[PDB]
Amino acid sequence: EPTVQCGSETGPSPEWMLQHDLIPGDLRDLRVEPVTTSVYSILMNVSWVLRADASIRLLKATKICVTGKSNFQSYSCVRCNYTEAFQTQTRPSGGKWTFSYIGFPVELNTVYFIGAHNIPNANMNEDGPSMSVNFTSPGCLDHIMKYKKKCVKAGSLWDPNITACKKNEETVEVNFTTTPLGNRYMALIQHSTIIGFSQVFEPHQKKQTRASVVIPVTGDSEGATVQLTPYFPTCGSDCIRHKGTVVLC
Amino acid sequence: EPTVQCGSETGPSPEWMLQHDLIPGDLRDLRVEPVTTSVYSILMNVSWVLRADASIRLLKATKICVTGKSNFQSYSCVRCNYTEAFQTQTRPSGGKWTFSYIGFPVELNTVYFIGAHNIPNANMNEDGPSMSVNFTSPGCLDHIMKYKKKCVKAGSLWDPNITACKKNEETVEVNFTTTPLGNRYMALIQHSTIIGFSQVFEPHQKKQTRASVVIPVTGDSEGATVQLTPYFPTCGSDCIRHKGTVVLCPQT
Amino acid sequence: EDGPLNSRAISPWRYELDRDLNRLPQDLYHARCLCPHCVSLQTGSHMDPRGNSELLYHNQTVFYRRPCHGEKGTHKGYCLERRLYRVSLACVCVRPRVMG
Amino acid sequence: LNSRAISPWRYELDRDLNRLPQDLYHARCLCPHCVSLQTGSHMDPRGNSELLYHNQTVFYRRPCHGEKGTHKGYCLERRLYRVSLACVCVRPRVMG
Amino acid sequence: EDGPLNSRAISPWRYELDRDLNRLPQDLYHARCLCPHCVSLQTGSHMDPRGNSELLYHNQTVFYRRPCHGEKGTHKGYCLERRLYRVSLACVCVRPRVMG
């Protein structure tokens, strides 16, 4: 009953220094599943189907690895052997052989390109063994996952409580509770173009009451859209935003 | 240098009566090409790409089959053995192994299919090793096959010499040349709807000149197309039809 | 149009594959025609709804093998099992039915 | 990222048997003009997209030039390569 | 606005110097864009607040100095310390992430 034990190994493979007379087969299949760990990080399992058509007579290692491509550029590889020498073209119990693995860290809006091939590979000038699977990871717009501290610092759970109302044909009033996580608030009112703008500076307050800002507007502002952009020292320019409403008082 | 030698054999494979511990691998790719023989027949050269991934250590036959679904439906396919055993992945010259075979009969208006698998075959409860290559052969509307005898009896190369013109508003005159190869003919004209119909009853004539047909019409016949079909006892209802074009005969 | 009769049929029918590891022939190219209504004969592409299309069938002697019934123990074996297999052949479109 | 840029780009497979890593990607943004910020689907032609590149490290192996005869051998030869990173919105170059 | 796109992008971006006695190259520049949002397209001077600018990094190998760890005593010595450096290349106009 063979098993697979793996450790991280990235770099040149010592197998490339020797040209092997006989080479193994390809891989039938490959699929990767996302899981959530208990608390609260995310790790990844990999699944593939080793060849059934007798391609097995010789094989030792199958290294599976990925380049992580976000704003940051990341790449690492995992090399490991199969601990027992195969003799059957399926499980003696039945079905094509299967194995899996865990341990790949996962980040925010990071797309991973995971590809596999058997070890050793072919010499120069033969057919390519390429087999890889593309993937999609979610961001911080999912209702499940507001609980990472990194996104919380972006005020993920913060409720601006924006209440925006029109005083007269030219002045609009907005009310909302302040926050100890930031100091500067701005306002965009968009119906078709920019109708009015203002900037607010306030360090903090212990009472934490609803604010009140006077913002001039041009033309008919009925049915416009209010949007708030909060500044935090951490998120900077990529700070998350929230809607706002327009009502008449 | 192992070579290929094929001998016709269809039926149950002896090797299918025994289960093998190890089975031979798949095939990379199968290509087949249509060729023409010297005289005047059409044949096919099949070609396949054999494995390099250690599957050459054991493989003895590579059964290749052809099926067609036309008026006929046929299944007779040849098993081919490999003369010599292999000890290496590629020739000392090098390159991917490619093999060929000629001799499968080919006919007209047919869609064929080609199978692929090797001998011995897989045991029970295993992966399907088959790959597909599809193909199609031409008929007798091309210049190169204008000399095919069967469709020659059908009138592959005949010249209709169709000339039809409007006699008047209620009659259209048609002129064309016949041949002893036909004895009964039909007659239709269609412009937007069926505007005229008839049949031609004339076995043959000795001196063999152009004909003349009187056909009534329902309304205007200008701009229509003339269509005539022979009734040949061999081609039956599968008989080719030649186009036509009507003109105006002026009273002057 | 010109072609092997499946490009000139009113209800053209394609030829799709099935696999078995213990059947002869390994493929039985069945017909599954999409055409639900007799196409117009002045076009070869137009959709004419005046007809209903249906399949035609026959039963073909085929070959199956399951392992030997007896526990001989010498080898797995097989049996020379003859049972008839259901196959569609060719499409025709037909006049529908009238109620009232 | 690439689902959010004003000139989005995708990544196309380019495999080799002699490049480390075995896979590299050259982005070609499909946009000949920068998209509109108000709709995200309407085509705004006032901009253009131009590829951004750098130069990166890759590795190759050649068989030994010296006729050793013991084996094919290997060498860690190092030349450079050109690969893109992204597309930028550019104000055109006009004359008149 | 004309130039090597460093003034022509909707997200203009200057340079800042980074000096060091033992980097090869001694010159690395960090992109430090200057706008809080993307510039306007129809005027070239007025300010368009719906966009954001973000850095895009990459890894380019450089060389550093430590003295020889072994106490040879011949001289202070030097070594080719080979690790990476993270720099910025271009600020880009991006559609932000908004919840609601």
Residue numbers in the entry:
A (entry chain I): 19 to 57, 62 to 271
B (entry chain L): 19 to 57, 62 to 274
C (entry chain H), E (entry chain G): 78 to 177
D (entry chain E): 82 to 177
Q: What do the paper's sentences say?
A:
During 2D classification of the IL-25–IL-17RB dataset, we observed classes of higher-order IL-25–IL-17RB structures. Further classification and refinement revealed arrayed trimers of 2:2 IL-25–IL-17RB modules. We refined these particles to produce a map with a global resolution of 4.39 Å. The higher-order IL-25–IL-17RB complex consists of a core IL-25–IL-17RB homodimer flanked by a homodimer on each side. Although there is, in principle, the potential for continued polymerization beyond this arrayed formation, we did not see classes beyond three homodimers. These IL-25–IL-17RB homodimers are connected by interactions between the membrane-distal tips of the IL-17RB type III fibronectin D1 domains. The physiological relevance of this higher-order trimer of homodimers is not clear, but given that IL-17RB alone is not able to support signalling, we speculate that this is not a signalling active assembly. Single-molecule intensity analyses suggested that higher-order clusters are formed as observed in vitro, yet at a rather low level (less than 10% of the co-diffusing fraction). This low level of higher-order clustering is consistent with the values seen in our cryo-EM samples, in which approximately 18% of particles form higher-order clusters. Reduced IL-17RB dimerization of the L40A;R46E mutant could be explained by these residues contributing to the formation of the higher-order IL-25–IL-17RB arrays.
The IL-17 family of cytokines and receptors have central roles in host defence against infection and development of inflammatory diseases. The IL-17 family of cystine-knot cytokines consists of six members: IL-17A–F, which exhibit differential binding specificities to five receptors, IL-17RA–E. The most well-studied IL-17 cytokines, IL-17A and IL-17F, are produced by T helper 17 (TH17) cells and are elevated in the context of inflammation. IL-17E (also known as IL-25) is a key regulator of type 2 immune responses and driver of inflammatory diseases, such as allergic asthma, and requires both IL-17 receptor A (IL-17RA) and IL-17RB to elicit functional responses. Thus, IL-17RA serves as an organizing hub mediating IL-17 family signalling at the membrane by acting either as a direct receptor for IL-17 ligands or as a co-receptor.
